[PDB]
Amino acid sequence: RHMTTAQHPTDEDLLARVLVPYKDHCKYLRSAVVTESDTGRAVARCEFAIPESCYIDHLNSVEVNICYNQMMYYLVAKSVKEGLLAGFESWTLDDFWKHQLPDILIARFASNFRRPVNPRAFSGEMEFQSVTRRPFLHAETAYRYWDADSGRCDGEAVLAFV
Template structure:
């Protein structure tokens, strides 16, 4: 196993700031640490969902909540990268830029999700990994974009598990065409 070149532990004030866009009962991410392995970034978080925000309690993590948890891992990991000026493609952003862009400009372009065994939504762990990041232009007159190839997994202490791969595109990088 490769040793991380940098480790950033839970930053509660930043977590509160980044998750403030969520209604209070939908702030599922409770803590996050980020490990940097060169251009590969790994965010690991703890979660708790006392009750679903939109449906009667199913007793397990469902696809809608996985999407919310994934986004919270993504946003908090990106915020940590920006704050500490580390990792691929976001090191030149400032926190005000990130806070202005993360909701309107960070889009899920493609996803694949696999549910292997039901996860107890009251207490579980998640991992978010940026495998690759690249700047690109979708056409000669188009503005620059950033593509993040990511994967995630969630698990609980009872063997519950799900995982997936998600392509994220940042459509406004602040660069002119």
């Protein structure tokens, strides 16, 4: 980790498992490369597409949040599987999936419009900034979405691993 950087291509079966509970037309995350930082932070670099809205007939805050959830569940599952999630290095994906996954709660969530993002196709990324005990793990994360034309938005989300 100080010597190399772990980096993983999209995990298609993990991605479909993540997306399985969503309505067909609310499935937006399409690919996700997972990394670890020199300091042990888990990062996801993702692509997204919204061919049609999920809940109502640019990229809006509802969709920003749906996309985060998907990106966040994927990154968490894939990081635990590959030993990159601070706090869970002694856990396996199994133990985590049925026991921690359900009890991930978004404690706080925030989004900010910068330039309108084309909902049809656009990129995103997120970081586990910190993980900290509080008898639960409190994790800060940051995220950002962009397209091929300066569209951008971003924000943060504090997670509680119960």
